[PDB]
PDB file of C-alpha atoms in Angstrom:
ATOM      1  CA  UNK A   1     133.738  47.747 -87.583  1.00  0.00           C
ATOM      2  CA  UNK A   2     134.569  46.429 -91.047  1.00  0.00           C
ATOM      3  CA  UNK A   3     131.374  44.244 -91.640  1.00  0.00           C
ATOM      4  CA  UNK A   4     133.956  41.148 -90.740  1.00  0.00           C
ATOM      5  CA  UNK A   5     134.314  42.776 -86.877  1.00  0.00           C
ATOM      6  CA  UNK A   6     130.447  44.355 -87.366  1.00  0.00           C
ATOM      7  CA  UNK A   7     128.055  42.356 -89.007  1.00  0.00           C
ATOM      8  CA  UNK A   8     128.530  39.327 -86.692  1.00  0.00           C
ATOM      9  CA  UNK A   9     129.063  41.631 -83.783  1.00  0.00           C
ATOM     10  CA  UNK A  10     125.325  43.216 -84.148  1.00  0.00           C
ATOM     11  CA  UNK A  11     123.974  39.410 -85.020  1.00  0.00           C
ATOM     12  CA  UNK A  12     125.033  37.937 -82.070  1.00  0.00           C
ATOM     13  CA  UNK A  13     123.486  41.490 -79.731  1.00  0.00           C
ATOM     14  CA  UNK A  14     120.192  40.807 -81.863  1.00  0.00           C
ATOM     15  CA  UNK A  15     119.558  37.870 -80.518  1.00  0.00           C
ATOM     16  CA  UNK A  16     121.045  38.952 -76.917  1.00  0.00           C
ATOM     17  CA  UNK A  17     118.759  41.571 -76.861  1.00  0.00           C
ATOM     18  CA  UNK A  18     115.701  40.563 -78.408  1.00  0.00           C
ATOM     19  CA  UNK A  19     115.917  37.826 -75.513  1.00  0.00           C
ATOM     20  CA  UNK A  20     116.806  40.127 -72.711  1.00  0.00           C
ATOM     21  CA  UNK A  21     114.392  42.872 -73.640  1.00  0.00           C
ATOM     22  CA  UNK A  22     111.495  42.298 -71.800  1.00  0.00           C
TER      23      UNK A  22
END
């Protein structure tokens, strides 16, 4: 994306994934 549609978008699948990793 543009950071504004990116940035957020990879924030909110951090956490996602960090807590659906395992």
């Amino acid at each position: 994306g543009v950071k504004s549609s990116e940035t957020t978008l990879t924030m909110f699948l951090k956490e996602m994934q960090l807590k659906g990793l395992p």
